[PDB]
From Swiss-Prot, chain B:
One Gene Ontology MF term: ATP binding
GO terms classed as biological process: DNA recombination; DNA repair
SUPFAM superfamilies xref list: P-loop containing nucleoside triphosphate hydrolases, Rad51 N-terminal domain-like
Natural source organism: Saccharolobus solfataricus (strain ATCC 35092 / DSM 1617 / JCM 11322 / P2)
Amino-acid positions noted as binding ATP in the UniProt annotation, renumbered to this chain: 103-110
Alphabetical list of Pfam families matching this protein: HHH_5, Rad51
The gene coding this protein: radA
Residues annotated as signal peptide: none
NCBIfam families named in the record: PRK04301.1 (NF003301), recomb_radA (TIGR02236)
Protein's recorded name: DNA repair and recombination protein RadA
Length: 295, 297
């Protein structure tokens, strides 16, 4: 589980005293001292040691054998982000048969991330990829054929071959965005090499062509349908769908990661929504080489 | 393009589609045959067709990232300030060609002209062409202030910005004509100019040749004037923008590209491609800010 509010045998009254004391994340609780938590939250010592137990337990730490672990890695295939940190957070990388969302303020690293993945995807399972192609649906004109270049170089790959494996299409508005997605089903069947679908800023045009709280219902109706569509595609055709949303509540997306800007080059990525992923934030950086770990 | 051009479709339904509010193909391409059948009062079987034929009509082609990059070094455009509007115009106002912006008073034509008479000076990295502009002012619309604000928002030098904009009042058609004539010198004297802006080209003609009595000659003259500005843009590799103020059988027009602007909820505005060879039809929305021309929300 995630979030404190979901802590077992816990009163909803202390849940405040915990968030009023600055204890928002479970991983922060998991390692706190019962004593200091008792004093800082103004809660009975006996209960501190409990929410800390419940919190640590919520992390799901499992000491597997080196063999058993090796077994599970061949059992599954993911695209690596380029940052072991971020990968770890994501239990390996971007999964197929599923849609992952990356949301956050402008410049949090969501774009770079999209590009980065539109390249690693082409790499072989040994180096972090899936020997496949990518479809980059460009919603707001963010694609930097330059950024794909640097990323490419640093990998010792062939710039032009890299660019040749990235299907590109600008989506000028919702109607076109919807259509483009609709014709996707053919593409994937026409070229089963495709493994990565990237729709940067999916919600974007909708908030634009359906502004205000007056359209809220239709905006969601239309968007949810657009998303339920991309999800299926990913599932049926065994590929990974990635979408980024740019924010500053009844979501469809499977996995949701939030990105935040940190001291200059650095950035933080946290698992918000996810069924199989354990909560926690990790730190990575935006380099020229691409998406790497900090320091 | 356009609905009346839909294959195997009766001209009878073409009306129930325009009377139901389905003007553009892109609106059809994503509608529900079901709802379309109720809204237009058309056989369910015909709806799913109009939509099939409509979706096909959008011309969706999944090009390779490489071929696209090739097309970018091949051409250079001026950015409108709204990534929306630029998307609609496949990058921006193109050179070697004339683009018209027409619409009711306040649709954003003016703002747009000013915004372009500044973005033109920006370097290719920021969306410009590191060039100057000629602003032929037909009805006294230039706002030395509006250039200022737009200028600031770009962290540019007010003074310098204004020094890279050639300005000239064109009091009547005859002067408008002369002015354009002498343009050939200017562009040759100063090859840095890259944006010609004639706001309200048709204006003086409609005034000096009013009524349905002169319409023929009014257009004979105006079209000759436009063919003129077009050539200039082509020959001297620059961009000519003209704006026309209209209020709201395939009619003949000279202008390469034509976009219609409409007012929307207060701040917002809609821009749609009407005439265009290489531009795919569809309307997008943008807004009028103090900063200048930007996207909405």
């Amino acid at each position: 589980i995630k979030t404190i509010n979901d802590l077992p045998g816990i009163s909803q009254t202390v849940i405040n005293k915990l968030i009023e004391a600055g204890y928002s994340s479970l991983e922060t609780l998991a390692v706190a001292s019962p004593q200091d938590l008792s004093v800082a939250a103004g809660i009975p010592l006996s209960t501190a040691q409990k929410i800390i137990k419940e919190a640590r337990d919520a992390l799901d730490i499992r000491f597997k054998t080196a063999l058993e672990v090796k077994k599970e890695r061949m059992n599954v295939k993911k695209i690596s982000t380029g940052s072991q940190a971020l990968d770890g957070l994501l239990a390996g990388g971007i999964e197929t048969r599923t849609m992952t969302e990356f949301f956050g303020e402008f410049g949090s690293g969501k774009t770079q991330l999209c590009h980065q993945l539109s390249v690693n995807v082409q790499l072989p399972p040994e180096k972090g990829g899936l020997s496949g192609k990518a479809v980059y649906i460009d919603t707001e004109g963010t694609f930097r054929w330059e950024r794909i270049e640097n990323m490419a170089k640093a990998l010792g790959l062939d710039i032009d071959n890299v660019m040749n494996n990235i299907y590109y299409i600008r989506a000028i508005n919702t109607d076109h965005q919807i259509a483009i997605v609709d014709d996707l089903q053919e593409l994937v069947s026409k070229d089963p090499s495709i493994k990565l679908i990237v729709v940067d800023s999916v919600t974007s045009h909708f908030r634009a062509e359906y502004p205000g709280r007056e359209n809220l219902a239709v905006r969601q109706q239309k968007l949810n349908k657009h998303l339920h569509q991309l999800t299926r595609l990913a599932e049926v055709y065994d590929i990974a769908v990635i979408i980024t949303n740019q924010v500053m509540l009844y979501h469809v997306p499977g996995i949701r990661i939030q990105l935040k800007k940190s001291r200059g080059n650095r950035r933080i990525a946290r698992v918000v929504d996810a069924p199989h992923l354990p909560e926690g934030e990790v730190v990575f950086a935006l380099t020229e080489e691409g998406i790497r770990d900090a320091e």
